[PDB]
Amino acid sequence: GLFDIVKKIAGHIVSSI
Amino acid sequence: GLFDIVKKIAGHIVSSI
Amino acid sequence: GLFDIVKKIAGHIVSSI
Amino acid sequence: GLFDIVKKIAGHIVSSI
Amino acid sequence: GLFDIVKKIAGHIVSSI
Amino acid sequence: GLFDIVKKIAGHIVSSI
Amino acid sequence: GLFDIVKKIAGHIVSSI
Amino acid sequence: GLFDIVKKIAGHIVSSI
Amino acid sequence: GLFDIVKKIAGHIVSSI
Amino acid sequence: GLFDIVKKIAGHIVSSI
Amino acid sequence: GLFDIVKKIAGHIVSSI
Amino acid sequence: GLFDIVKKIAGHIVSSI
Amino acid sequence: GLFDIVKKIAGHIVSSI
Amino acid sequence: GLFDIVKKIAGHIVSSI
Amino acid sequence: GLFDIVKKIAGHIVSSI
Amino acid sequence: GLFDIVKKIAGHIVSSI
Amino acid sequence: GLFDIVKKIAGHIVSSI
Amino acid sequence: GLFDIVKKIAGHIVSSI
C-alpha cells in the first residue's frame, strides 16, 4: 500500500471547505 | 496497490467544497 | 503502509475550514 | 471499503462567485 | 474501512466570493 | 478504521471572502 | 408569507432500531 | 413573515435503540 | 417577523438507548 | 386563520425525528 | 390567528428529537 | 394571536432533545 | 387587520418564503 | 391591528422568511 | 396596535426572519 | 502483513449501518 | 505485522452504527 | 508487531455508535 498525492494551487483568492 | 495523483490548478479566483 | 502527501498553496488570500 | 479514497457531501449548498 | 482516506461534509453551507 | 486519515464537518457554515 | 409554518431538515439523518 | 413558526435542523443526526 | 417562535439545531446530535 | 394540527404516535418502541 | 398544535407520544421506550 | 402548543410524552424510558 | 406592505430585494441569489 | 411596513434589502446572497 | 416599521439592510450575505 | 477480522451479530431485530 | 480483531454483539434489539 | 483486540457486548436492547 502506497499513496503519492501532490496538490498544488495558486491564485489571487483561494477558498476551500 | 499504488496511487499517484497530481492535481494542479491556477486562477484569479479558486473555490472548492 | 506508506503515505506521501504534499500540499503546496500560494495566494493573496488563502482560507480553509 | 479497503484501500479506498472517499469523498461525500450531503445537504443544502449555495455558492456565489 | 482500512488504509483509506475519508472526507465528509453534511449540512447547510453558504459560500460567497 | 485503521491506518486511515479522516476529516469530517457537520453543521451550518458561512464563508465570505 | 405573513402567517407561516416552516420546517426544514438538511443533512445526514438516521433512524434505526 | 410576521406571525411565524420556524423549525430547522442541520447536521449529522442519529436516533437509535 | 414580529411575533415569532424560532427553534434551531445544528451539529452532531445523538439519541440512543 | 386557525391551524388545528394533531400528531399522535403509540407503540412499544418508538424512534422519531 | 390561533395556532392549536398538539403532539402526543406514548410507548414503553421512546427516542425523540 | 394565541399560540396554544402542547407536547406530551409518556413511557417507561425516554430520551428527548 | 389592515396590512400595507412593501418589499424590494436585489441580489445574485435570493430565497423568499 | 394596522401594519405599515417597508423593507429594502440588497446583497449577493439573501434569505428571507 | 399600530405598527409603523422601516428596515434597510445591505451586505454580501444576509439572513432575515 | 496479515490481518484477521471477525464481525458477528445475532438478534431478533437487527440494524447494521 | 499481525492483527487480530473480534467484534461480537448479541441481543433482542440491536443497532450498530 | 502483534495486536489482539476483543470487543463483546450482550444485552436485551443494545446500541453501538
Numbering used by the authors:
A (entry chain G), B (entry chain A), C (entry chain M), D (entry chain E), E (entry chain K), F (entry chain Q), ...: 1 to 17
Paper quotes:
Supporting this hypothesis, we here determined the fibril structure of two AMPs from amphibians, uperin 3.5 and aurein 3.3, by cryogenic electron microscopy (cryo-EM), revealing amyloid cross-β fibrils of mated β-sheets at atomic resolution. For both of the studied ffAMPs, cryo-EM data unambiguously prove an amyloid cross-β structure comprised of β-sheets with tightly coupled dry interfaces and strands perpendicular to the fibril axis. Despite the dissimilarity in lateral fibril structure and the difference of extended versus kinked β-sheets, the 17-residue ffAMPs uperin 3.5 and aurein 3.3 are remarkably similar in their residue composition.
A recently developed computational screen aimed to identify fibril-forming AMPs (ffAMPs) additional to uperin 3.5 found fourteen new sequences, including aurein 3.3, another amphibian AMP secreted by Ranoidea raniformis (Southern bell frog). In contrast to the case of uperin 3.5, we did not observe any pronounced polymorphism of fibrils formed by the antimicrobial peptide aurein 3.3. Wrapped around this inner cross are four more strands of mutually similar conformation, each having a sharp in-plane kink near the outward-facing His12 residue, which is enabled by Gly11 leaving a void into which Val14 can fold. The overall packing of the aurein 3.3 fibril is highly dense, with the SASA buried for a single layer (fibril cross-section of six lateral chains) covering 9802 Å2, which is 83% of the total area of this layer. In the outer chains C and D, the C-terminal part of the kinked β-sheet forms tightly mated β-sheet interactions with the C-terminal part of the inner chain F, overall showing a stable interface of three short β-sheets, resembling lateral association between β-sheets in the crystal structures of short amyloid segments. Overall, the lateral association of β-sheets in the aurein 3.3 fibril shows very few potential polar interactions and is mostly stabilized by van der Waals forces. Such sharp kinks in the peptide backbone are the hallmark of Low-complexity Amyloid-like Reversible Kinked Segments (LARKS) within functional amyloids.
